[PDB]
Design a protein around this ligand. Structure first.
Ligand code: FNR
Ligand code: FNR
Ligand code: FNR
Ligand code: FNR
Ligand code: FNR
Ligand code: FNR
Ligand code: FNR
Ligand code: FNR
Ligand code: 4LR
Ligand code: 4LR
Ligand code: 4LR
Ligand code: 4LR
Ligand code: 4LR
Ligand code: 4LR
Ligand code: 4LR
Ligand code: 4LR
Lengths: 207, 207, 207, 207, 207, 207, 207, 207
């Protein structure tokens, strides 16, 4: 298999829950193991901008998502915001790639400064110190200079800053087609196969 | 009228022509005067990702857009890429706000470095030296550290970096609803009235 | 196979065309796919400092190089300087390593600043944002502080700055032996097998 | 095999010889090839803080270590401090990962500044220019701002700064258990299998 | 008495509780007054990596520690994480030295950025603004560039960054001997007498 | 006694040996303990610019200086350039103030970069990490930007940069009076009594 | 003649008037034209630390110095502190080298910041903008970080920072011999012949 | 004569001895005086990559080179690595231009940091403080960020960084023709006549 076997997928309180749910579903279909984390604000976003009725507690959540995605048993692990017992809290864990999708400006800040106040922030701190993949998917506009400095710092240290900025070059016809563009970019970044967005120019031999 | 009477709208070669066409139409409906500039790459984008058959030469272009938007005669001015005779080339011109929507990574670079190689780049250089509004709407993912440094420099100097990153908090049902979210943000930035995106929380009196 | 299956090889207007032609030939012999780009200045260099009569237009060029190197059909793709349809223009393309050999001081500048004015510059911009290999082979002396700052910025972001500075530790007897030293270094950087430069010290067991 | 086939292991004059000897032994047991370098100060440390009677000259040293670790013939190569003939002195060598364990503050300084005064420093300079793994294991307290600036510079360039700071979360009962924690972290960094430190949380499915 | 009469000892959630308990005991034996603060994460660390059954609430904690260490009544004060009434919250308090042992990467971050979210962070903020001693004892490996930048900033402002990196030059035979090395370094930094680690070279008169 | 009981006095290869010999004599007369270190270049300076015939080996040197200054037995300790057994090599030593008088540009460099190549450089590295007094007395003209950057870095970290730049405000009549001005400044910096340079203005009550 | 025909010699209020008077005399003997400027504080220094009774007003001063040095009529020009009519105030003047000897910390500050409050400061501002020689001779100890930053800035812009730090390698026997060392260094910097300090090593052919 | 009368030519341990020998020969033919310095590593390079059997000791070396180049007696001075008696060690020496050809990455480092550990490094330190020409000829590939930062610092201070990167625009037919290109560039930098590389375009009057 190309790409990581295990992804830590953290969802934080930016207005783009569709992208994290779609990514979760694609990752499950590519038979990856997902360690799923979600912030309190992200739970309010999902409740108010989607049709998904996500249970509050980690075990009910894990059961719900396993159904929602058609996952295998234990394929999706759910950990709460102070569960330091969970793999992502330590660099001695097995290697996984981490994606924060969507990534709020507050979570971006915490990761840039090293705040480690909850499991998502500590997980990203560990990805950085271990040189493990870390992809942040901000959804904000305008970006202020505070946001941009935090993104630059992290980019300079090897994180991938992948804004939720879909392109129109595959002729999108629906909101779902724009959500899939962003998701396809994330999977490409992670090195995981995808067939939602063709490889640009692959059939063009000469100019 | 709130907001600027005249906007310089430059469209450059990022995959988001829908946003610049929609903005052009909203600006016309709010009876603003638009000085419209478009790059060669942006013409290829529009030809390949939209249904809009935009003529190549500035006078045919001006006639086409005036029809497309329902504008009044002389409401939309079109200037070519080396027309130094046009108002945006000089700080002695009448004040206008400038928006680059969409803004390619190459145009972002040129504006950050001061390259002034064509009328769009010189127009942005003049907006900066005159302290006139300058809004850039990048559409790229990932953003590299080169992109992020160029955005930060410009943000620090007072430009507004407004990525084409729509939110989902107004329940979008179509691609058009996502395009209008971004457009609504731009008009808000410019101080121009809009009724596509409600004022968040305006009716909430207490927590 | 070790190393990348596909290399984007861009030749720009520094006085070292021999190195890019030799690299092209080595890449073909290692059965890699080459996406070949060449600047207008690089065409003048090749015309004046080599015996290679390279045709001007991309399809005639592709036929010429395919012969010159003994390549298989479609092994070498040639794209012109504004062919945005070509794979290297987008990060959604299939992954390839990019080498700019030789790299003029102007191309170094454009890549460091993000100028994206033609397909070579945009290709390098995409390599950077995608975290794909990017090797620059400058040929200039002295290096000014402008050159050195541009190289440092790019090195800091993970590009490899590999100056056309051959060593003499394999006893070179000809101009070709110096050209092959530099080429051997490039292939090593890319992780592609080569037998022009032995592995230093591989038989030395103790001091 | 996961991880590098060949490791350059340099031991320098910080008070932690136990960690470099233990790492050497683990690397031998995982059937890796080790290019072993040791500074004059590190020889005084080993003589005074361990029970290991290490011979002075490279060939006697190689014989001693080969016995001490149970290595195969030629599995451990020993090179002296000015043996420029040895593989680590040149980037044209075969790829290996380099670890400096322990890393004195003086060696940290030399690597950060590019001093290349002996084979260890030149070896690290080459690892950096080749983008090959470089792990530094400092043992000092307090760390001054000079130390911290030197570490930051190197971290920013992709070196791994792994201080000899063992954790207590695997219930250590002996000095050997603390030495093995640090060694286990190094092997994890290098991507080499180890069974001294379990994978944190690997059996935890839900919070 | 040499050294401070009063120490604020904060324990945060890094895997090194042994060092803070040992320091607490040494400080009590040198008849100092200790203002003891402990984070929620540090309570989970102590519960899981030590044999010490520390009560949760500040008054039960104070009674427990007073027994554990043989302290005099009122020698150890315990304050909770939001007790702004406590001396360390204000610069108008009586002078004391502050040690954060162990110091998590999150607490390091908060102190470097000025976050003041709880009493430990505010206490360190006050130590800095008052020019009072502040010693941080991180326990992490690798250190990332985020950690290293946060340490450098604080070192530059006069904090002492004293990693939990014991040396082996006093022939340690047990885990306790390594814990005491680090503790001895802290007491030396604070100017408090200790007889666990001899004064290096004190009897050496000539080379 | 005011000021430190023990001073590490290092003499390095700048053209000002008179100042270090005079300081050594003043320190002995104020009954301080001096740990004396001298570089190979400083030995050549003393041989060629003074009348002092200093023996080469540390024990003969210690006997010579003890006579030259009228010191008590064991008041002056002499350590060689690789004597890591000596107190100044470790921060676990008893506290002393360190003066490098004169300080060559090479020694200034090594201290600024953390090179630790010999006992003087390591001693200064330890003074810095321990927050112990460190006074550097450069003697060079012009100062280049390399020198000035190295001095600034060290000044910013709390070292005292005290150039061998005597003043004329005490009416000097001899070379000895200029040497004593500089020495008086050093003793003032260290907080040690001196009566060579009066306290400026001490008898002036009103303007 | 080697070196400049005209020198602007400014004397400011550091305790080293001997050096500026000696330089003035050497410049006169080498038949240079001197534009002489002196600050109010420098007049108090000269009155209190030398035997030279310098008149207050520019014309009496010019007559006095012309006698003191044996100069030709009009060889020494004296200008007051607000005489903007004088050549050094404008870059349109004839080229001259400028030396500030001695240079107070206040004058160093003004030159580094561009303060131009009097003719000396404006003269130095003009030397810098014209790329004309500018030599500053500070006399201060310790140098603080403010002093060192001001010196570095100016050194980086091409000024020569030449501290009043005499060497002892020409066997000085008097205060005058130390004053002449510094003066000899200044003349060397300016490219003016001098025979007070031999050319180091000029007769040494082999090592 | 145009250009300097005296050149300090230092050869250090990069793989390009041919360039320093050829430069030495050209300098002798232009009747310049050469102060020749060579490092221990450079002696190993010359022994292994050239046919030149250079004696070890300075006087035998001077005799050998005087023969090899056809020099006049005393035209080439040879100084050893610790011969502080030699002119280049002091700024009070007669002015000469300094070239380090080839310049190892270690020597580049030492010059950038001010290390002054041997006569070559001190000579370069003096060139910088005296504002005398300093040309460095590195031979390394890739250049890391450490190398590039060291080059930039020195370039910014006025050193010339002239990499051993020959061009092909004079139709080179041999290894000697590439060596002469680099040498011709160095002589041009120094302002010394050369007829190996024509003046580009000198006969071109119009475009
Ligand atoms: C409905 C709704 C929508 C948004 C938000 C909030 C809510 C309630 N917030 C804000 C954000 O959630 C807030 O600053 C949190 O403190 C983020 O905390 P976490 O990073 O999720 O722990 C938010 N933040 C942001 O960066 N981009 C966005 O698009 C949104 N949209
Ligand atoms: C179809 C198509 C689509 C895109 C592009 C090109 C084409 C042809 N380009 C690239 C870009 O247009 C190129 O780097 C130009 O050089 C930009 O020039 P202007 O800034 O418009 O003058 C591009 N650039 C970018 O920053 N974001 C994008 O989404 C796209 N999409
Ligand atoms: C014959 C010849 C030789 C050279 C050049 C030009 C020509 C015509 N140029 C200059 C360079 O080509 C010019 O600055 C271009 O603008 C570079 O454009 P590209 O980067 O190729 O698009 C050039 N540039 C450089 O960096 N190093 C070199 O060795 C040369 N040699
Ligand atoms: C017994 C003993 C113990 C130590 C040391 C020395 C000796 C002799 N040194 C110092 C160090 O070895 C010295 O600065 C050397 O110059 C380092 O040279 P290398 O980097 O090994 O070539 C030392 N240095 C350090 O960074 N951390 C340490 O723990 C120690 N411990
Ligand atoms: C068992 C255990 C062990 C550790 C941790 C946690 C737990 C539960 N954490 C993490 C840390 O406690 C987390 O990022 C907290 O958010 C830190 O909060 P405080 O700074 O104590 O408020 C942790 N953090 C760190 O910097 N170094 C370490 O050694 C450890 N070890
Ligand atoms: C006679 C004599 C005089 C001087 C020197 C040398 C000699 C031999 N050196 C140079 C210096 O000693 C050289 O760069 C050494 O490498 C410094 O090494 P240490 O720092 O003493 O180990 C020298 N260096 C300096 O910074 N200022 C000076 O005044 C002198 N004077
Ligand atoms: C007797 C005497 C001696 C000194 C001073 C003053 C006096 C009165 N001052 C101080 C200085 O003159 C003061 O800060 C002035 O404001 C400098 O002004 P000018 O730069 O000359 O205009 C002084 N300043 C300094 O930088 N180094 C010194 O050696 C002295 N010595
Ligand atoms: C045969 C051979 C070849 C090279 C080297 C060595 C040897 C032995 N070294 C390395 C270098 O010489 C080493 O880092 C020295 O420590 C440099 O010391 P000096 O700067 O000459 O004192 C080397 N260094 C470099 O920067 N570029 C190179 O091309 C080479 N080539
Ligand atoms: C939760 C936990 C064991 C954190 C310690 O992990 P690491 O040693 O800092 O990578
Ligand atoms: C096209 C033109 C008149 C440019 C000059 O404008 P400005 O004085 O630079 O603002
Ligand atoms: C030519 C083209 C489709 C450019 C867009 O690519 P990407 O989304 O910016 O990587
Ligand atoms: C010892 C030696 C051949 C050094 C040259 O290696 P590289 O070309 O600098 O990687
Ligand atoms: C809890 C309290 C009184 C904080 C104010 O202290 P300070 O004036 O900020 O030192
Ligand atoms: C020579 C020696 C014991 C060095 C270790 O000292 P420290 O622990 O780094 O202060
Ligand atoms: C006193 C005077 C004419 C100042 C103007 O000089 P410049 O044009 O600023 O060089
Ligand atoms: C070898 C020697 C006399 C060094 C002193 O030279 P300089 O005064 O630092 O230029």
């Amino acid at each position: 298999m190309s790409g990581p076997e295990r992804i830590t997928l953290a969802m934080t309180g930016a207005s783009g829950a569709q992208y994290g749910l779609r990514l979760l579903d694609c990752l499950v279909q590519e038979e990856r193991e997902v360690h799923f984390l979600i912030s309190k604000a992200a739970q309010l976003v999902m409740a108010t901008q989607t049709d998904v009725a996500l249970p509050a507690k980690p075990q009910a959540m894990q059961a719900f998502l396993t159904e929602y995605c058609g996952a295998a048993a234990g394929q999706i692990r759910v950990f709460g915001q102070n569960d330091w017992m969970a793999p992502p809290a330590s660099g001695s864990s097995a290697p996984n790639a981490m994606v924060i999708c969507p990534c709020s400006t507050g979570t971006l800040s915490a990761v840039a400064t090293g705040a480690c106040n909850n499991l998502i922030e500590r997980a990203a701190d560990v990805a950085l110190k271990e040189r493990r993949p870390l992809v942040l998917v901000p959804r904000e506009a305008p970006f202020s200079s505070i946001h941009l400095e935090n993104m630059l710092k992290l980019s300079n240290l090897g994180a991938v800053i992948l804004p939720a900025a879909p392109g129109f070059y595959h002729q999108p016809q629906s909101v779902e087609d724009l959500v899939d563009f962003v998701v396809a970019r994330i999977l490409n970044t992670l090195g995981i196969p995808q067939d939602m967005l063709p490889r640009w120019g692959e059939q063009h031999l000469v100019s």
